Amino acid sequence: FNLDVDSPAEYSGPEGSYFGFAVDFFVPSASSRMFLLVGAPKANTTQPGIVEGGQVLKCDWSSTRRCQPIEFDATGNRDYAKDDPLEFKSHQWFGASVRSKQDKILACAPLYHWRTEMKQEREPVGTCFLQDGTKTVEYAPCRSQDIDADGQGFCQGGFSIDFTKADRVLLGGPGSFYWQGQLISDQVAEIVSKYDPNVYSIKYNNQLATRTAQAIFDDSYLGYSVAVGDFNGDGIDDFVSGVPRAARTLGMVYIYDGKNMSSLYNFTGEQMAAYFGFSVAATDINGDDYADVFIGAPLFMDRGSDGKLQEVGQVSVSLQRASGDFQTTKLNGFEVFARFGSAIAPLGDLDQDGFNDIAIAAPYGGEDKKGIVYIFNGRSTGLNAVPSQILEGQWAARSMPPSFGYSMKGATDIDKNGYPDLIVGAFGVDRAILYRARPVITVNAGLEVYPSILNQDNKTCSLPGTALKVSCFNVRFCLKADGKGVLPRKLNFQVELLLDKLKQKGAIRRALFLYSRSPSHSKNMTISRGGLMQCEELIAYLRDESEFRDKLTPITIFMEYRLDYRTAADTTGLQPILNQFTPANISRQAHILLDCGEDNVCKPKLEVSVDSDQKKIYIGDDNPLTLIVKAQNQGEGAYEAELIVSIPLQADFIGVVRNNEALARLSCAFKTENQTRQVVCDLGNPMKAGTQLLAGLRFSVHQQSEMDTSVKFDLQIQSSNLFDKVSPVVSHKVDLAVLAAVEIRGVSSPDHVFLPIPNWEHKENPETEEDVGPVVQHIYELRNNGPSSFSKAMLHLQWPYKYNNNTLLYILHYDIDGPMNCTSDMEINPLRIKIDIHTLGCGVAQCLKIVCQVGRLDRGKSAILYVKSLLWTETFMNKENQNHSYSLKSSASFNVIEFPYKNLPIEDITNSTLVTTNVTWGIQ
Template sequence: HPMPVVLPLLLLHFCSSFNLDTEQRVVFSGPPGSYFGYSVEFYGNSCFSFSVLVGAPKANTSQPHVTEGGAIYVCPWNKSNCRIIDFDKQGDRYFYINDELTQVEFKSHQWFGATLRSHGNNILACAPRYYWRTEHDIPFADVTGTCYLSVDSLRSFVEYAPCRTERHGPAGQGYCQGGFSADFTKDGRVVLGGPGSFYWQGQLISATSEEIVKAYYPSYFLLFVSGQKQTGQVQSSYDDSYLGEEMGSYFGYTVALEELGKVYVYLQKGPLRLEPSGTNPVGSQAFSRFGTSLAPLGDLNQDGFNDIAVGCPFGGEDQQGQVFIYNGYEEGLEDTPTQILSGQWASSSFPAGFGFALRSNKDVDQNGYPDLLVGAFGVDRAIQLDNVKLNKKESTRRTLFLDSHQPSLVKNVSLETNGDGVCYESKLFLLNEGGFRDKLSPIYISLNFSLDPQAPVDEHGLRPILGYHTEPLIQQQAHIQLDCGEDNICVPDLKLAVYGDKTIAYLGDENSLTLIFNAVNEGEGGAYEAELYVLLPPDADYSGIARNNEKTHLTCFHVYEAQNDTRHLMCDLGNPMKSGSSIWAGLRFTIPRLKDTYKVVQFELQIQSKNANNSESEVVVYKLEVAALADVLLQGVSLPDKVLFPPPNWRMSQGLREEQDVGPELQHVFELVNIGPSVISQSTLEVRCPLSAQGQGLLYPVELVTQGPLTCSSQHTFNALKLKGTTQLKSSKEHRIQRRDVHPLVENGNLTCSTVECWTLQCTVGQLGRGDSVILSVRSRLWAETFIEVRFMGRQVQREGQRVVAVVLWNKQDSLYFVPVWIIILSVLAGLLLLSLLIYLLYKVIHLLNICQLFLIKNLFKLK
């Protein structure tokens, strides 16, 4: 009697559960009611320069007279503090229209930050509800939308408003809402969606970042971008098409009548050839907006197919929002999600909106798996799920059944009662070597058989049973044949040498460090899954690979262990790292946040493999001594740098009442700058200036002004005579100065503290960080009674021979000196006498000429 027997053949493997780690999340919060989290984006190129950009379209900024204009916040990925980015500080602009100053643009409630995208160092943020008043004398305004672009890591910004054109109103681009959706292409080209153009036909507009920057001119309101491409207006049958609308498209609305939401998946079978997949996930809750946002996650479960996150911002309990994680397979997406993330915040005024915005496909912490940003604008939050959590040891399927291409196979067979055995064969195939890493662990195969409970009974109404001693489970194992000799056992001999380009790390410095390592396998077999592990110090950041030649192919990523709060850098050295191989490569680090409590910074490096024998190298420790080093820049200036002696129109006063009665003002300004890298504290700054020479005053100190952590004292009192402040001098005919002979007080013409009496300022400088400075200003007066035709030099503490110099020049204008009245009268009389003499002589000369003329005429008549 035939007995149907079910033989499930199961290929055992160490399966892994790959889930988004909700316990290691980072939550960023924004101002209440700002819709913080309406849009989210990753920003940065390396794991330690990564930040999170968050749009808050109802936030208030410092723009004058703008209410809820919207804002973009930047949040360091491993911290929860965020700061606003000033894309636009200008506020609304006003132009003269018909000789009347008119507001031409309106940025209040423009929803800036509703759309946010990044591409490398380029950031694009848009305000789709921005509107402006046209130049026509009509009362309506055009909702054109506008965007701002930064191409230099958020240091400068240009406006891009391609719908703000001469084509006004609904028939043109007046209701464009440019920037309702936006993105960058792979090569960095900007693409904007404007769903309201041409009676809501919609349009797409595109230009390169370079073209946008080149066309921008802040004084021009309407800008033409050369090279811009855009779709045009077509026949009226395409009205209300909303080309360029991304959210709420209602495609397939008749399929989901209760607004469950649905995601349509199309598989690309070739260039521009898309075919619908067999599975299209549908939401399970009415009005939950399933599919509002999508984010590619890469291959989470390492099965060779990409996975996806689907936002459902009003789903779940209390409509707080959910995010569904779907794994991909060769036919599209799995029917059911592998993980559901739920919002954990409630809001009395509005649902949390958890999942309204999603961004992923960036590995922030470089642990080899992409991270996910989730926006929850209803509670003004953005959540970053830090990494992918592996619940068990990582492995992957290495062998599949040829018949099913699956790790399990079920066959129905029939056995006769006579006890004769039947032989069946099922072939397995090993995946390509690049499809898995584990080549050492055995491949376990199990056979489990049981009687078919659905089989009919025999003629006696009886069912067959298995023998009491029958083992229903049989297990075997197979090994991958390695290049390790007859015993198939590889015994590597791993050695590691490490060299660094510096041995000291300075407090406050970036401390760029390159570690060159040489990894060698001198054993008799290959080292499988060989990896270089680098235990990072708490303040060290990995910044990249320094390859010594083009033949070195090294990949490294971070591994974070939350239990002991340690970070490793893991670099793949080969699978296997063959016997006799020698790998040279460099790893670049920075150590920017050193604390003065450290004495050394220590890196630990080791090669580890999965071999059963001799699997590790010795641990190599590389240490850097922690030291403080600060260079200071000491500079100064004299105001003015040249002084005339005595000053023009200066008159000697009978008594000293005001500052100008002393003499011309002279100010010395000194600046001490810490150019780093370390912090300095309790430093001493000494300023010395000439006070008097040979009993004659040179400088009268008036005032000391300091800025920064600076405390000064002097043995000399400032403004000891308590003179009043400077007032404008009045000319006077009295108290004229008589010129004196000039006797230099110093032979070489320089007044320094080695030749004359000086007064000294002793200043204590407090703590100065890198780039910080203190400023000291000494205001004084030159004593005008001391006429010294020499160079005057005020001196600070000498550093590299630098001094602050003021040159005093003798004023030799004769008009300044008194001339007696009798000299003036005598000079006038002498002038008049000289003039009379000249007139008399001229008269005599004319008379003589007349006589000569008469004589000549008389003689001429005689000749005739």
């Protein structure tokens, strides 16, 4: 919010050169000056026979805003033979990526081509150039004896680059090993010391590089984007790389260790083709000293209000914790086809709030596709999801979209003003813009009145231009301001005072200032910093009883300050802005003395009553809790009376009671202040004597951890009166009840078997299921529905194994879904295997018991037992009465033996059900 859009720095390169495609700050150690680095990949060069070689220009901020090209090479194409170019620098896109650490500058040309040493080719290996202060070395790790598509030939190394704290260069490219992509890390010292101009392929010691993998990973494009940060215990920056086409185009983000190239963590997009990992960033947003991961997916399609897909874009915010497990949120774009996650730039810290901030750009968004950049401030809870500032660059599209954003660099202070600033390149219009951060001022106003309670009959002082005596109070307002960084030692505020703001409007004003004889007064102030508010003084008076009527409505003193901004430090001019969240005004109230008794002071008697409504709320659900409040004043008038309701933790305020006509409609608002959660309701100003109000308050309680027993609500009344200003605090609690609805269900597949079985041949020693009978499957499910969970439960299955020495249902195998272990009192599948109406229950038949131990079933969970058995055919027919109808009956019961909630009343939960398989003859 503190970025200056009034007068930024506009830099412009040659047309069609894609000036601004890449940007970074240049901060030399040998100079106090700082510069801008701007890439121009399509720019034309002085290099012989080279068309659009590309440039990296050094732009001076101090004077004239001039830009000069840095000369890395200036050499044309080298030769393999008489006429046999060894390299092709035409349209090599040099300057497509630019990174600068201290006095080091790294610029790459991803479209640079080779032919290698063997065949005659053109292979986009890519090349970079490292230049420190004088000497310039070429760095091309993808250029080597490993070639073509199978090798590093098409790598296009230098597509993305970054520096570490240890002076290691992180260089990826997408085209390695049939576009699997790879990352290559080398120490800067190695790159400089090992450079031989006569050696086209240089082996670097201590080179950290990924290597080819299975062809399944082809066309993943690893190294599309890169970022650095340390996500393990060590102090060395580790490697973060976007790989947008991976995971069958779902997209991924790889994190590799900084010491060795071993993998650490992974990320995966939830939507295909969204190009998850198009851009990546590493910063600590929550100030926890643990770096957090930002992942762009500009093509992500979310659901509109109508439910139809729309292209917006999404940024994945992943917060690192001490354990290594990430807490990830998601931030959706706004405009369609804006490509919201295209560029993510750490601003390290913009407003000096103590927490780092960040910038996300949607290059094709904004008004008429001119581009837009969003600024997101960081907080202790992580990133603030609401952008505090919008940057919309104004440039007209001519040849192509004037992409604004798509390249950004923050986290450097070029003005030395104490605040970091931001570069945003637009390569469509071939331009780069430097936005400078305004200083932030935190100002605390204050106001009070002497005396607050006005006695209309007390005339003691006045001199209103040769006139009578009037009742006069005093208005004292205090103003202090401080800040950080560069900003002057004295500021000019313009304060405005308004008397009786409640009714000054279209009606009579009941208070005027003494000397001014006016309801309003203006003052030009001047303050200092560090503290100790400078206070002015003014005296106002009250009209006599005759001039007006109403003695009730409070007199509201309204103070408002301006702070006309003139501060420069002569740098252009730069005006500081006040703290984002801060009140431009403060108000106090005065009251005319009415019915205060013989004591000439009001002493209220305040009482607060509350009833139970629901005596029990259930620990797993969201409970419609409604408190019936009785507030009464049995004493004198209470000025600015309020009902203070303290709701701890779980409870959140819904609203007042609209439906009931016997309950008050009183306006209430939820406040969070001084690390407290409260809801305050107006009891009236004043709250008159004998007043008795009745109003309900609806709340929703979820739970806090477990074993919490009851939950508290604290109620009291407060007012502005000097004596007896409060009611005695009355606390009311409601007990947490444990209620879990648990049912058991079952089925038989099939639920019936028709005899005779088709193609039935009996063998004394059955090898397979085919030789035994059809497959009868019983399924039992124990599901917890009711809000409360349970920690442990027992499940007993009674099965009809045999009837008179003859097998009925022969159990083959049984499977379990959910948190359950099971055991059979008999051995299942002992013979192994390969591939009129009479009920037979476990009572009349030999029983096979299956005992299961169940545990931790929550509200939305459940446990299932699948029993796969064969119908024994040999038993049926024979002398068994042959044609006849049997219903095979198995039963299952469950008992819940305990709950996770301790010291709460718990009733024993039990129930049972049965599953019947009816086997009968149809031709009977």
